[PDB]
């Protein structure tokens, strides 16, 4: 559960370049032999994505911010990648989305899971029936409050260690849209020595997860190796195969999706990448002819918002009213009309010079930004037990017989010792 790996070593988050990845179908709508323009959370082309790899003395399982969405890409031989953990705290404090492929089927669950230092899945002691079926469940210790569960079709996962170049390529897309989580996937063989292949790919939806939870961080799960001959301390002495997984960030960008006769995308263009791409976006075409075209308009954004209001002087003496030598009786309460002046309420409400202060129908903060039509001040002195009677819809010796506030009273009551 919480046992740290012996050979794990931290490495700096090195970066790389992505050529044409980050493209996926925004919706199930079908289109063919057309160039469609759409804006959604996308990974910009030629962007920077993290450089992570798994070996027997550097194990990569860092916590990465999710933000509005991320992109995944990895080159595999034995499919070392196991799954992911999605959530805000990645702990039982809140719900976390987790996807685990434990060699029989893809399992998606939304519950309150207990966080672990190094969550993952592995297998041990295979011997003469290759197996590679999930053995231990370190992903989480306990679960509760499950609001969603899903199961995919059964299948067998091949974790055989293979020599040569990387024969497999897996790329997924993870995004949140008003709490709606969408998953895209793509699988294609490759012959790769290092880094990523030069080419284009299109990712298709995997499942639909209308969950509706806030996710700000996520983890990448890895599959390690175990054997009868070279085991280790539980569970620090376990090792995993060779793999490299890369994580990107999605941004609200507009792409020109070029659809073939069968509807598959063969090309993509990002407006913000290249001014030539800006020309293509403006023309809504994948070909640009020799010439000068107007794509958009440039503008200089304000540095900061500057407010210069006129002098607020000539204030009516509210302080004198509150500090006047004498006040009228509760029955003889004076009705003071205030107009033809400015009111500075910052010194009154926020000075904390009075015992109690409350407002009805409007918060004191909003009153500072509002312009009124008529303002009246009613000054009176009453006993402590009678202060509670000053409110809309009250009764008593003061509320009914001396001074009554209407149920729709939008003013405020001020009192002090």
């Amino acid at each position, epitope marked *: 559960q919480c046992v740290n790996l012996t050979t794990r070593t931290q490495l700096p988050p090195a970066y790389t370049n992505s050529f044409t990845r980050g493209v996926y179908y925004p919706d199930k709508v079908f289109r063919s032999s057309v160039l469609h323009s759409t804006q959604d959370l996308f990974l910009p082309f030629f962007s920077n994505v993290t450089w992570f790899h798994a070996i027997h003395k550097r194990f990569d399982n860092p916590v990465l911010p999710f933000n509005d969405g991320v992109y995944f890409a990895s080159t595999e031989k034995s499919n070392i990648i196991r799954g992911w953990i999605f959530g805000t705290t990645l702990d039982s404090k809140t719900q976390s989305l987790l996807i685990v492929n434990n060699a029989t089927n893809v399992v998606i669950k939304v519950c309150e899971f207990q966080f672990c230092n190094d969550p993952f899945l592995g297998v041990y002691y295979h011997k003469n029936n290759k197996s590679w079926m999930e053995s231990e469940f370190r992903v989480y210790s306990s679960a509760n409050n499950c609001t969603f569960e899903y199961v995919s079709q059964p299948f067998l996962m091949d974790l055989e260690g293979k020599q040569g170049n990387f024969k497999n390529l897996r790329e997924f897309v993870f995004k949140n849209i008003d709490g709606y989580f969408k998953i895209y996937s793509k699988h294609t063989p490759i012959n790769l020595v290092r880094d990523l292949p030069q080419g284009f790919s299109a990712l298709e939806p995997l499942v639909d997860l209308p969950i509706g939870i806030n996710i700000t961080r996520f983890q990448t799960l890895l599959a390690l190796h175990r054997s009868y*001959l070279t085991p280790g301390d539980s569970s620090s002495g376990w090792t995993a195969g060779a793999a490299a997984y890369y994580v990107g960030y999605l941004q609200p960008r507009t792409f020109l999706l070029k659809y073939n006769e069968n509807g598959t995308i063969t090309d993509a263009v990002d407006c913000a990448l290249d001014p030539l791409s800006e020309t293509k976006c403006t023309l809504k075409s994948f070909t640009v002819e020799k010439g000068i075209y107007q794509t958009s308009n440039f503008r200089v954004q304000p540095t900061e918002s500057i407010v210069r209001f006129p002098n607020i002087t000539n204030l009516c003496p509210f302080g004198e009213v509150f500090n006047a030598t004498r006040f009228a009786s509760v029955y003889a309460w004076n009705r003071k009309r205030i107009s033809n002046c400015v009111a500075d309420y910052s010194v009154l409400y926020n000075s904390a010079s009075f015992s109690t202060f409350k407002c009805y129908g409007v918060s004191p903060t909003k009153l500072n930004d509002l312009c009124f039509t008529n303002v009246y001040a009613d000054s009176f002195v009453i006993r402590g037990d009678e202060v509670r009677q000053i409110a809309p819809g009250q009764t008593g010796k003061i509320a009914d017989y001396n001074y009554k506030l209407p149920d729709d009273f939008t003013g405020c009551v001020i009192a002090w010792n």
Partner: antibody
Amino acid sequence: EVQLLQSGAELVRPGALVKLSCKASGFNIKDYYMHWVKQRPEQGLEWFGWIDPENGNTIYDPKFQGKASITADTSSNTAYLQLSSLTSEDTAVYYCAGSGNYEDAMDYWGQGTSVTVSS
Amino acid sequence: DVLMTQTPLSLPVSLGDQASISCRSSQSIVHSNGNTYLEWYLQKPGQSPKLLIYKVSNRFSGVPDRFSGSGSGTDFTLKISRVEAEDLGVYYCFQGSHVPRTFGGGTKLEIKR
């Protein structure tokens, strides 16, 4: 020195259940597997199952499948065994082994417990 | 489920003689890496079984150097260089790794006279 401690003997009626404890001393219960074994005089030992306190996964002898459940305690450093729906055929001596460190080359055994199921 | 058989049921050996106990398995327990999965247990009178050998080729810590195993495939034999008075008991064979573990029929040892 490590030692595995178990109850000396136990006696229950048919159809009842027995709760057995195997104490861990001198080693970490979480990081080491725990095994169980049953012995009878006629044909010797019979395997029962294994459990990992860190994980909790359990496998049972096809004969005992559905007949028992295994549990372990972390704080107490003691592994528990439970048998249900006991019958006359369940009379035997039980043993526990562990301290594997994910390796076969390392294991011990306790003095065992004598369990008799009769009326 | 793997079935294991042992023979002979018992054998006498005078002090200083060599003892041979063999075990048979219904399925191969050797794999690609070349090592073997088997453990030898000895149960002394009034005492529980204790490990003797692991992998058939490596001796368990604290065990006398007289105890050693050898073999290949599904056929193996436990060899004791010099049997002493403390070797009385029953010898067992164990199938390890990740599979329903199997036990042997048992082999008893006694001193000759």
